[PDB]
Symmetry: C3
Subunit: 127 residues, 3 copies
Amino acid sequence: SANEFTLIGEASDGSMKFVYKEEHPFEKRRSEGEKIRKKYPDRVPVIVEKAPKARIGDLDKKKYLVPSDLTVGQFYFLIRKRIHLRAEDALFFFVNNVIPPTSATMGQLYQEHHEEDFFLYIAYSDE
Amino acid sequence: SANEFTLIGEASDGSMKFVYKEEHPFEKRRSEGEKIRKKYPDRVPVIVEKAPKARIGDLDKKKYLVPSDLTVGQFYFLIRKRIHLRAEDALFFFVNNVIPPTSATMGQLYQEHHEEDFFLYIAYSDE
Amino acid sequence: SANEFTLIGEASDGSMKFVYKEEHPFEKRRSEGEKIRKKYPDRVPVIVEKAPKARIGDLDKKKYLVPSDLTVGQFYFLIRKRIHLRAEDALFFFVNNVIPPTSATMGQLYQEHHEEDFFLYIAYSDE
């Protein structure tokens, strides 16, 4: 197909703003994250939000406390069941605009990417 | 959701006991694993068992001889077809209580994790 | 199952020949790949072909221009939708006969594996 290409996929705009951070002042989030990490050191606190452009279902709950040794892939299935995804619908997680390996553990992601309020922030989208 | 978290996922209990090892004495397993590795050096012998708590189907066969360059992900699909998983059901593999990368090859997992009887042991579960 | 193994999976024959290369002389491919990489440096040109033995659907288009920061896993879903895979059908990508990690980016694969005509070649199969 001479000079012909099919342009597919979109470069991430990196513009994911979490509503959680707009609705809860930093000092309140940090106090809470610090406390929950002290109380439950084998668990990590995670905020999960849908990317605004995503056309899949929203979550009822956004604050999760998950085992540090749980993988991304296990978390994927737990979240997918909560939004009732059509069988053929894709679901991707983004941490700081990057999709993590599905065998990474939630503790590993948290250690590397948690924010200064001691939460790990994950966005999800359908593309 | 003030002080509110949804607790999801379970920390692995690491208590996976393989029935294969309870039914076949170590020396018989080792003799067999040694022999099959000598005869078929480009293949690895694998014991696959369902985690007792898993509510998905059991396998008819547990002893597999697989190409060393086959990936975990290819193996996943071969095993999934054998238990007739509902489309939305999850399937996870565990080697020594850890989920391997799906692009790892069976030979790589075997080299790192085979037991002293020269078998690689994989447990599977739905969570 | 004494002396009994179930032999499953197939060792890759590494014999994937791309029709694209048989139909377009090297110098024409290189000129084009060089030009498109100069013009669109944040995108990578990819040739996608079905492995001849695969019993899944063929693609209408084989020449794609994809964002460098798109993952393999995102690309998987874009290609899967284009061939209308039955829900339970597997789809695997091979670059130089090896399945890449699904979290690798297309730019990372391109940097490591592009050919001298400046295209990245991906084969897909159902096993």
